[PDB]
Design a protein around this motif. Structure first.
Motif, mmCIF file in Angstrom:
data_model
loop_
_atom_site.group_PDB
_atom_site.id
_atom_site.type_symbol
_atom_site.label_atom_id
_atom_site.label_comp_id
_atom_site.label_asym_id
_atom_site.label_seq_id
_atom_site.Cartn_x
_atom_site.Cartn_y
_atom_site.Cartn_z
ATOM 1 N N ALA A 1 -3.589 6.607 -0.426
ATOM 2 C CA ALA A 1 -2.135 6.681 -0.397
ATOM 3 C C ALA A 1 -1.663 8.135 -0.409
ATOM 4 O O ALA A 1 -2.374 9.040 -0.844
ATOM 5 C CB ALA A 1 -1.533 5.926 -1.589
ATOM 6 N N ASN A 2 -0.448 8.358 0.087
ATOM 7 C CA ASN A 2 0.154 9.685 -0.015
ATOM 8 C C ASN A 2 0.427 9.937 -1.476
ATOM 9 O O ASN A 2 1.095 9.117 -2.100
ATOM 10 C CB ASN A 2 1.460 9.798 0.762
ATOM 11 C CG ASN A 2 1.296 9.518 2.238
ATOM 12 O OD1 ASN A 2 2.037 8.716 2.785
ATOM 13 N ND2 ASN A 2 0.354 10.190 2.891
ATOM 14 N N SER B 1 4.808 3.740 -2.538
ATOM 15 C CA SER B 1 3.830 2.665 -2.691
ATOM 16 C C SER B 1 2.410 3.194 -2.856
ATOM 17 O O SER B 1 2.007 4.169 -2.211
ATOM 18 C CB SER B 1 3.876 1.712 -1.497
ATOM 19 O OG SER B 1 2.804 0.781 -1.554
ATOM 20 N N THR B 2 1.648 2.528 -3.716
ATOM 21 C CA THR B 2 0.304 2.971 -4.041
ATOM 22 C C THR B 2 -0.747 2.369 -3.121
ATOM 23 O O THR B 2 -1.899 2.809 -3.161
ATOM 24 C CB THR B 2 -0.043 2.625 -5.488
ATOM 25 O OG1 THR B 2 -0.280 1.217 -5.591
ATOM 26 C CG2 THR B 2 1.100 3.013 -6.413
ATOM 27 N N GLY B 3 -0.390 1.370 -2.315
ATOM 28 C CA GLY B 3 -1.325 0.771 -1.387
ATOM 29 C C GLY B 3 -2.214 -0.285 -2.025
ATOM 30 O O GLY B 3 -2.191 -0.533 -3.232
ATOM 31 N N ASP B 4 -2.987 -0.953 -1.170
ATOM 32 C CA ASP B 4 -3.907 -1.998 -1.608
ATOM 33 C C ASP B 4 -5.286 -1.376 -1.808
ATOM 34 O O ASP B 4 -5.884 -0.875 -0.852
ATOM 35 C CB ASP B 4 -3.944 -3.129 -0.580
ATOM 36 C CG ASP B 4 -4.826 -4.276 -1.001
ATOM 37 O OD1 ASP B 4 -4.448 -4.989 -1.961
ATOM 38 O OD2 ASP B 4 -5.887 -4.474 -0.380
ATOM 39 N N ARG C 1 -0.372 -0.705 4.200
ATOM 40 C CA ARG C 1 -1.374 -1.251 3.276
ATOM 41 C C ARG C 1 -2.153 -0.154 2.568
ATOM 42 O O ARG C 1 -2.649 -0.365 1.459
ATOM 43 C CB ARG C 1 -2.378 -2.154 3.993
ATOM 44 C CG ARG C 1 -1.911 -3.534 4.325
ATOM 45 C CD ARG C 1 -3.131 -4.424 4.562
ATOM 46 N NE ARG C 1 -3.717 -4.913 3.312
ATOM 47 C CZ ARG C 1 -3.200 -5.901 2.589
ATOM 48 N NH1 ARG C 1 -2.086 -6.499 2.995
ATOM 49 N NH2 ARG C 1 -3.789 -6.301 1.469
ATOM 50 N N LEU C 2 -2.320 0.992 3.215
ATOM 51 C CA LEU C 2 -3.022 2.115 2.618
ATOM 52 C C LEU C 2 -2.125 2.947 1.713
ATOM 53 O O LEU C 2 -2.631 3.821 1.002
ATOM 54 C CB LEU C 2 -3.608 2.997 3.730
ATOM 55 C CG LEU C 2 -4.701 2.329 4.583
ATOM 56 C CD1 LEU C 2 -5.061 3.165 5.810
ATOM 57 C CD2 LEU C 2 -5.931 2.146 3.728
ATOM 58 N N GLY C 3 -0.820 2.682 1.711
ATOM 59 C CA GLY C 3 0.113 3.504 0.961
ATOM 60 C C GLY C 3 0.496 4.785 1.672
ATOM 61 O O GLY C 3 0.884 5.763 1.011
ATOM 62 N N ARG C 4 0.464 4.790 3.003
ATOM 63 C CA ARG C 4 0.647 5.994 3.802
ATOM 64 C C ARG C 4 1.856 5.871 4.720
ATOM 65 O O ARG C 4 2.159 4.789 5.229
ATOM 66 C CB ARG C 4 -0.595 6.284 4.661
ATOM 67 C CG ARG C 4 -1.778 6.809 3.877
ATOM 68 C CD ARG C 4 -2.940 7.131 4.812
ATOM 69 N NE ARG C 4 -2.464 8.006 5.876
ATOM 70 C CZ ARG C 4 -2.991 8.097 7.095
ATOM 71 N NH1 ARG C 4 -4.042 7.362 7.453
ATOM 72 N NH2 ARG C 4 -2.428 8.899 7.981
#
Ligand SMILES: CCCCCCCCCCCCCCCCCCCC(=O)O[C@H](COC(=O)CCCCCCCCCCCCCC)COP(=O)(O)OCCN
Ligand SMILES: CCCCCCCCCCCCCCCCCCCC(=O)O[C@H](COC(=O)CCCCCCCCCCCCCC)COP(=O)(O)OCCN
Ligand SMILES: [Cl-]
Ligand SMILES: [Cl-]
Ligand SMILES: [Mg+2]
Ligand SMILES: [Zn+2]
Ligand SMILES: [Zn+2]
Lengths: 304, 307
Positions: A19-20, A21-24, B212-215
């Motif tokens: 991630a750069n 939301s924290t993602g899955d 999904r990756l938070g990007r």
């Protein structure tokens, strides 16, 4: 020239998959692994930009054709999932039921459910003789399973399935059916003989198979689901005896235990069949108990 | 449970990647064997479930249906990775000192108008974009001007859209796309408008996975270039607009320290055929590398749009 172990590549891999939301977290973990493996293979095999962009273009075509699940079958990935599920069962002693084999990408939900017996050939097919498939659903002790849902689907004499027929010649749920077993656990499907399937000749799956020097054909076969409260859901098939492709399936799905004998019988009229002579296949299912169903598979599936 | 090393899995891999009358392409068989084997091993190692695999298979269907596989190649750093490998090869061959390469991206269009020396490439009015002049010289590794070099430029409008890829249909053919042929002094100049950064199609497969990756799926404002010259290798590069907040946070990992030229505000724009007196000016020089052995060992063939 090798760059995979350089700090810049390692940092790039970490950035692309985090991630750069924290993602899955699970998606991030899998992407990190697959992207890292891809980068290392490119390094190891010296895969050129031209080769990469050809592969990228191929992925565009694969998805445009809607064939990624067909290629999954053709490259043995679908069979591989069964190998892993088989090894899991063997470690837990959840074997001894009818063996699984691959679902393939052509299931369609919603066929009408019948008690005991179903006639599933709705469209005339002069190239396919009548076929009766019957047997019992039982548990590991040989006791009949009542209320089991046995679902069947297979191709016509041109190798096409309803809902996937490019000629438009088949009605909804032609050659697709579902039986709910009664107290004696018995099921029967009244249908026509399938002919083997081949990949769409202009599609992406056949394009890559051609580059590999491989055909895209399957032997004649019939698919089954069996669903029962208190039993794990069975995905399996059987192949039509004597098919020349029986051990040369492009989807690697054939099993010695899934080739029942075919016998010719008479009296087809009394069974509602289109001819007096018909082909008959006895095929019994043996289910395994649950623990929770640790092997049922959720994937996109057509419906109507 | 681990099955990868079993004879059954190894036999399956070899069968899937090799020929059955037709013999197949050996290089494709080699690459498939490796990538399929690696995938099987990752599934084994990470205990990737059937449900997860089929979700990935479904994602590949969506990716290709959206025609975005090359956009995901950029967003996952695969496109940048190719540049890293080309850079290492050049460094091994002593092809150093040129303008650094960076990624092409998937939005080139062949056939743009070619002019001598100077080109005005903004064809469509864009009230959200001020005038921009990009100029410099094309030189070789000895610092000598290169005459007859073809400097090609393409970039986005103030909505971050490129002509031929603009979903609103608002741009004409080759808007913000053009090529200048250098004269004897090696100089080129483009008269255009300031680009704004690009973002992935919000409903597309690439943004779906990035989410999904938070990007994020954004690029800083930038300008693309090809430079082609007889006897020199074809340069693929870009520069980023100074001061863009995303300049070191490109989702396609394309930014390089040498490719951020200073931007200066100048006056006298009317005399340069610009729409305002005040304009933004960027000096940007190209240094080319020689074509050793008569062959361009790094030029790339990939699908590209045309008209
Ligand atoms: C553990 C992680 C491992 C990676 C996971 C990735 C995802 C799953 C992959 C599963 C393994 C199988 C991969 C199969 C890729 C097949 C690509 C075929 C491309 C192809 O046909 O290229 C021709 C040229 O050949 C060539 O140039 C030779 C073949 C070069 C293929 C290079 C592919 C590199 C990867 C790039 C995409 C990312 C993965 C894609 C699955 C096109 O050329 P033509 O024009 O003459 O004819 C065609 C008409 N146009
Ligand atoms: C494009 C060209 C350039 C780049 C090429 C790079 C190729 C490999 C290098 C790394 C990239 C990996 C890409 C993975 C793609 C799928 C990941 C996202 C899928 C996704 O959104 O799944 C969610 C669930 O996540 C999950 O379930 C998490 C697991 C998903 C990942 C499993 C991947 C398995 C391998 C599949 C590919 C090989 C098959 C063909 C050979 C949502 O899904 P949902 O919950 O809404 O469900 C609906 C379907 N049921
Ligand atoms: Cl002109
Ligand atoms: Cl969109
Ligand atoms: Mg220098
Ligand atoms: Zn089938
Ligand atoms: Zn761009």
């Amino acid at each position: 020239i090798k760059v995979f172990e350089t700090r810049e590549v390692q940092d790039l891999l970490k950035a692309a998959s985090s991630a750069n939301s924290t993602g899955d977290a699970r998606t991030q973990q899998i992407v990190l692994r697959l992207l890292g493996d891809l980068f290392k293979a490119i390094d190891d095999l010296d895969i050129t930009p031209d080769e990469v962009w050809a592969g990228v273009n191929y992925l565009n075509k694969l998805g445009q054709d809607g064939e990624a699940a067909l290629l999954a079958a053709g490259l043995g990935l679908e069979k591989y999932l069964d190998i892993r599920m088989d090894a899991a069962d063997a470690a837990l002693g959840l074997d001894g039921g009818t063996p699984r084999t691959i679902e393939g990408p052509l299931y369609v939900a919603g066929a009408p459910v019948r008690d005991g017996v179903a006639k599933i050939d709705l469209d005339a097919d002069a190239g396919a003789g009548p076929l009766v498939i019957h047997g019992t659903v039982k548990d590991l002790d040989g006791k009949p399973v009542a209320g089991a849902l046995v679902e069947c689907w297979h191709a016509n004499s041109h190798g096409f399935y309803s809902h996937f027929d490019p000629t438009g010649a088949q009605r909804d749920f032609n050659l697709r059916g579902a039986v709910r077993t009664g107290a004696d656990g018995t099921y029967a499907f009244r249908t026509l003989m399938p002919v083997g399937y081949g990949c769409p000749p202009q599609g992406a799956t056949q394009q890559l198979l051609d580059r590999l020097g491989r055909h895209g054909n399957r032997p004649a076969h019939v698919h089954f689901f069996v669903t029962s409260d208190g039993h794990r859901k069975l995905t399996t098939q059987f192949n039509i005896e004597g098919d020349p492709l029986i051990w040369d399936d492009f989807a690697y799905a054939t099993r010695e235990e899934l080739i029942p004998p075919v016998t010719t019988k008479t009296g087809g009229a009394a069974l509602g069949l289109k001819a007096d002579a018909y082909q008959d296949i006895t095929f019994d299912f043996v289910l395994t108990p649950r623990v929770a169903d640790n092997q049922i598979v959720e994937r996109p599936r057509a419906s109507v």
